[PDB]
Amino acid sequence: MLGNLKPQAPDKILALMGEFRADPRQGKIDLGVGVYKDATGHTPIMRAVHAAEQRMLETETTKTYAGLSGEPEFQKAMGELILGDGLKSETTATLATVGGTGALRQALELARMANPDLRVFVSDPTWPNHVSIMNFMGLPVQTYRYFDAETRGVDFEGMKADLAAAKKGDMVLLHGCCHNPTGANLTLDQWAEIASILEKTGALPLIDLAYQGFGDGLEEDAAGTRLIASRIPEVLIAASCSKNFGIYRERTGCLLALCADAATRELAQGAMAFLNRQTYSFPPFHGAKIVSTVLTTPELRADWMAELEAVRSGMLRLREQLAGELRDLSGSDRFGFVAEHRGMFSRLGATPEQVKRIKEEFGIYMVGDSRINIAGLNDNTIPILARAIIEVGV
Amino acid sequence: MLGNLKPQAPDKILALMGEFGKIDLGVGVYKDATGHTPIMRAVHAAEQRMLETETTKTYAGLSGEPEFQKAMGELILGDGLKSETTATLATVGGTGALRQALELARMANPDLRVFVSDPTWPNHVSIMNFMGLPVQTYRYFDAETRGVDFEGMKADLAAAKKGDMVLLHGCCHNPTGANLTLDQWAEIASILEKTGALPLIDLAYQGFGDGLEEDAAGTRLIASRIPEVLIAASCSKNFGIYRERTGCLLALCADAATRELAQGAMAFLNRQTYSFPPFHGAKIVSTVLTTPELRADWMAELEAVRSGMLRLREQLAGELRDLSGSDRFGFVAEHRGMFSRLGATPEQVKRIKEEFGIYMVGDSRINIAGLNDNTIPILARAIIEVGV
Ligand SMILES: *Cc1c(COP(=O)(O)O)cnc(C)c1O
Ligand SMILES: *Cc1c(COP(=O)(O)O)cnc(C)c1O
Ligand SMILES: Nc1ccc(CCC(=O)O)cc1
């Protein structure tokens, strides 16, 4: 029977990794990595995180089945981290998920249950994994302009015009901050306008928040999400603790369904809990507990924010250096966008040929869409990247 | 939009838990003499070791770690593990394995039907309904003798066809406790072999029946006869790591070509559902299984648990016998696993729970591990006084 199986395409990421590994060049650089890495090219376990696991290992007396929708301590702590004082629990439904991806998958299954004729709008471009899930689910996908290939900024007029076409009940997916892969983000003013458009159209906003704390700061990064949450009655948020907590493999995420009234919140929470049980029963406990421990424990929380800020500030400094070097070598401020982008990613705006020229001639690897991970750069590699970009004619 | 969400049916087994001289004999978790579900010695040691050796939490394997995959396959199939024709996927618990098992099967056969035992784990049907998969049932439990209605079972299974899937409980049948013998398994294998129906084996209690190896003997028989087999295994109970959410799906194929296909479709299945599988539980399991010292202690403790439970079944059966002279309750000591169905009518069941405080599942499924020397006669009285 299983021979009827249609061959599924590999992750590609691996192929990219293999491409790098075969290269016999000593000065080969890898900017294609999708996770954070410190100065020694390592993805460390955060101090607060290691402390939490140490504490859990000493406090846990059992591992019996726990909450189906996650633990209250975690739901509460997360909604507060994301929504701040604007958290109205009376109308907020929370579901612990298997990472941010799990949260996204669950948000799409929920919406389809509420509206079978659901149509989803995604930015151009967006996290490929978004389209993967949607295509797999067989949902009609529609695109809205977003990245301006010329300025490397946000084509806001195009985005607004495109979103205007959204009908009542349709879903529009927005990255709360640190747009992956572009690194180009909306200003709070641009968010305000988007909201007015969503009110007018009556489309349900699904916010993918996977990098809170990597752009301008924890609070600052949640600003857009918090504006949408106060203007629009129904909002779906997919939060990830993978990167901002550095617990990638633990698979900890969170789905928040903001509702118009309490009756609808019970309807949503029930359907969410139901969705978890029909997929894998209970959600992963470990990473979630680490997170609730860090946020509730004063000492730990403080140390976590402090470490995240050191990471954030460092990446920002790398951005300024690259932009500076690029300025000096270019004799123009053409590449200034690198210093404006937020998140650990940036799309350079180089065509596939230029991307291939950079690799062949300079030994620098990056995603085929010219996306680079700022965290893969340093005082020794920035000069090379600066030269490569210039020499290839970007 | 969300106001259109219809209300859904809840997990009655877990609902009971919430509703809870209180005596809980519901949810399928192991309990010690003091009503606690401890963490196993090896597990605790494994975690301490992990906290000390892990230097990163970056993304890992989409199908799980090689260590976990190999260890699990050896645990389940013993020396019958043919890696060249075996695909393995790490999942979110045994339940996630079942869901993935159905997804994979449905991909390869959009017109598949699933045959389930009467009765069977409620979650089996809910998931199939959710997906919209047609469910057929085969006679399994014998209402009177409390054993297996083997002749009815073979009869119904004979009606399966190429493409159909038959779900079997590898050992310790939930919720009855009635189990097939090896001789019965060999007969089931011949039926399946002639019908071409793909068997899905739910292995959630390996080690709670007769022993680690004996509980996998049936699964190993089917595997050595049927070229294509699917096994959804759970580490929740036998490792006592319920909340960690760890299990795996094994796709046994007839050749390497299909193996690569299955492995690819399985990995894709995780990618489209939640990307990577949880790491913490799978790590504990592999560490225990690959560390001779830890493994030995785990088996020792699992052995202790298994023996104790049998002690209880015997003690309970005895109390009932010496409380009526009615040998009709002997099936209790004959059933193998953590559960056993008293056979009491639904009204009898709800009767005792609201006053005696003994909360058992509606179909009179009792978690034997909930009992103990001082709670046994109280349960025995109830049964006797209410009949059945
Ligand atoms: C990383 C990421 C996620 C979440 O990944 P998980 O590892 O599943 O938490 C979701 N969306 C985007 C855009 C991401 O970059
Ligand atoms: C326990 C059990 C499972 C698996 O539960 P998980 O917590 O998801 O591992 C699956 N099937 C049956 C019959 C079970 O008893
Ligand atoms: N969804 C779920 C429910 C219950 C259990 C525990 C086993 C049982 O009670 O049958 C596991 C999973």
In chain A, the domains with their CATH numbers are 11-44+313-393 (3.90.1150.10), 45-312 (3.40.640.10)
Task: List, in sequence order, every residue forming a beta bridge with B340; answer none if it has no partner.
Answer: B366
Ligand 2 neighbours, Cβ below 6 Å, are A 281; B 28, 93-95, 121, 174, 202, 204, 234, 236-237, 242, 247
**Could you say which of A96, A210, A288, A323 is catalytic?**
A210
Interface touch B37/A63, C-beta < 8 Å: yes
Q: b vs e for A279-291, b when ≥16 Cβ sit within 10 Å of the residue's Cβ?
A: bbbbbbbbbbbbb
> Which two three-digit tokens encode residue A137?
């689910």
Q: Does B14 touch chain A (CB under 8 A)?
A: yes
Report helix, strand or coil for A183.
coil
Closest CB to A57: pick one of B51, B96, B276: B51
What span, in angstroms and rounded, lies between the C-alpha atoms of A204 and A162?
15
Q: Return phi, psi of residue B34, to 5°.
A: -95, 20
Report helix, strand or coil for B36.
coil
Q: Which amino acid is at A94?
A: T
What span, in angstroms and rounded, lies between the C-alpha atoms of B161 and B192?
9
* Residue matched to tokens 């609902």: B15
What span, in angstroms and rounded, lies between the C-alpha atoms of B372 and B385?
20
**A66 C-beta neighbours (distance < 10 Å), count:** 16
Report yes or no: A268 and A257 within 8 Å, Cβ to Cβ: yes
Task: List, in sequence order, every residue forming a beta bridge with B117; answer none if it has no partner.
Answer: B138
User: Of the ligands numbered here, which is closest to the C-alpha atom of B99?
Assistant: 2
Q: How far is B139 from chain A (nearest CA, A)?
A: 25
Q: How far is the CA of A100 from the centre of ligand 1 (A)?
A: 5
Q: How far is B268 from chain A (nearest CA, A)?
A: 7
Kind plus residue range of the DSSP H or E element containing B135: strand B135-139
> What size, in residues, is chain A?
394
Report yes or no: B105 and B127 within 8 Å, Cβ to Cβ: no
Strand A92-98 with A252-258, pairing: antiparallel
> What size, in residues, is chain B?
388
> Is the backbone of residue A41 left (phi > 0), alpha (psi -120 to 50) or beta?
left
Q: b vs e for A343-377, b when ≥16 Cβ sit within 10 Å of the residue's Cβ?
A: bbbbbbbbeeebbebbbeebbbbbbebbbbbbbbb
What span, in angstroms and rounded, lies between the C-alpha atoms of B230 and B198?
8
From B2, B3, B28, select the one nearest B14 (Cα to Cα): B28
> Is the backbone of residue A106 left (phi > 0), alpha (psi -120 to 50) or beta?
alpha
C-alpha distance from residue B280 to each of A53, A96, A118, B247 (Å): 11, 16, 36, 12
Q: Would you give the distance in Å from CA A231 to the centre of its chain?
A: 23
Report yes or no: B90 and B97 within 8 Å, Cβ to Cβ: no
Q: Chain A 82-121, CB below 8 Å of chain B: which residues?
A: 97-99, 101-102, 105, 110-111, 113-115
Which DSSP category does B79 fall into?
G
Q: Return phi, psi of residue B169, to 5°.
A: -90, 120
Resolution in A: 2.2
Q: Is residue A210 annotated as part of the catalytic site, yes or no?
A: yes
Q: Is residue A369 annotated as part of the catalytic site, yes or no?
A: no
Q: How far is the CA of A240 from the centre of ligand 1 (A)?
A: 6
Interface touch B59/A248, C-beta < 8 Å: yes
Report yes or no: B359 and B349 within 8 Å, Cβ to Cβ: no
Find, in chain B, the residue whose alpha carbon is nearest to that of A106: B273
What span, in angstroms and rounded, lies between the C-alpha atoms of A370 and A272?
38
Strands (E), chain A: 29-30, 92-98, 120-124, 141-145, 147-148, 153-154, 171-175, 204-209, 235-240, 252-258, 345-347, 364-365, 371-373
Q: Is B330 annotated as belonging to a binding site?
A: no
What span, in angstroms and rounded, lies between the C-alpha atoms of A347 and A183?
7
Whether the link from the prior residue into B7 is cis, omega within 30° of 0, is no
HEC per residue, B260-304: HHHHHHHHHHHHCCCCCCCCHHHHHHHHHHHCHHHHHHHHHHHHH
Residues sharing a CB contact under 8 Å with residue A50, sequence separation 6 or more, in sequence order: B51
What sign has the CA pseudo-torsion B184, B185, B191, B197?
Answer: positive
What span, in angstroms and rounded, lies between the C-alpha atoms of A245 and A291?
8
Report yes or no: A79 and A256 within 8 Å, Cβ to Cβ: yes
From A264, A150, A191, A102, select the one nearest B92 (Cα to Cα): A102
What span, in angstroms and rounded, lies between the C-alpha atoms of A318 and A320?
5
> Which two three-digit tokens encode residue A297?
């424990």
What span, in angstroms and rounded, lies between the C-alpha atoms of A63 and B25?
18
Closest CB to B5: pick one of A6, A34, A113: A113
From B170, B141, B208, B174, select the one nearest B13 (Cα to Cα): B174
From A11, A96, A79, select the one nearest A280 (Cα to Cα): A96
What span, in angstroms and rounded, lies between the C-alpha atoms of B233 and B246?
9
Task: List, in sequence order, every residue forming a beta bridge with B247; answer none if it has no partner.
Answer: B91, B234
Q: Return phi, psi of residue B162, to 5°.
A: -60, 135
> Which two three-digit tokens encode residue A96?
């612990």
Q: How far is A334 from chain B (nearest CA, A)?
A: 35
What span, in angstroms and rounded, lies between the C-alpha atoms of A144 and A198?
13
What span, in angstroms and rounded, lies between the C-alpha atoms of B254 and B140?
29
What sign has the CA pseudo-torsion A189, A194, A198, A200?
Answer: positive
CA end-to-end distance (rounded Å), chain A? 51
Please give the angle made by the CA atoms of B164, B167 and B168, to the nearest 5 degrees.
135
Strand A235-240 with A345-347, pairing: unpaired
Tell me the DSSP string of A107-131: HHHHHHHH-TT--EEEEES--HHHH
Report helix, strand or coil for A293.
helix
What span, in angstroms and rounded, lies between the C-alpha atoms of A51 and A252?
18
Closest CB to A2: pick one of B2, B5, B258: B258
Q: Is B121 annotated as belonging to a binding site?
A: yes
Q: Is residue B185 annotated as part of the catalytic site, yes or no?
A: no
What span, in angstroms and rounded, lies between the C-alpha atoms of B359 and A56?
31
C-alpha distance from residue B62 to each of A30, A95, B88, B359 (Å): 21, 23, 11, 41
Interface touch A278/B242, C-beta < 8 Å: no
Q: Is A339 exposed, middle or buried (0-12, 13-18, 19+ CB in 10 A)?
A: middle
What span, in angstroms and rounded, lies between the C-alpha atoms of B236 and B239?
6
Q: Chain B 228-267, CB below 8 Å of chain A: which residues?
A: 228, 240-245, 251, 253, 257-258, 261-262, 264-265, 267
Residue A281: list chain B partners with CB under 8 A. Answer: 92-93, 95-96, 123, 245
Report yes or no: B176 and B119 within 8 Å, Cβ to Cβ: yes
Helices (H), strands (E): how many in chain B? 14, 11
CA end-to-end distance (rounded Å), chain B? 50
Query: Which contacts (CB < 8 Å, 24+ apart) does range B376-382 have?
Result: B376/B312, B376/B315, B376/B316, B376/B319, B377/B319, B377/B323, B378/B21, B378/B23, B379/B23, B379/B25, B379/B316, B380/B316, B380/B319, B380/B320, B380/B323, B381/B323, B382/B352, B382/B356, B382/B358
Q: Which of A54, A95, A281 to mutate: most B Cβ within 10 Å? A: A281
Report yes or no: B163 and B114 within 8 Å, Cβ to Cβ: no
Q: Does A39 touch chain B (CB under 8 A)?
A: no
Residue B276: list chain A partners with CB under 8 A. Answer: 99, 248-249, 251
From A241, A278, A297, A237, select the one nearest A94 (Cα to Cα): A237
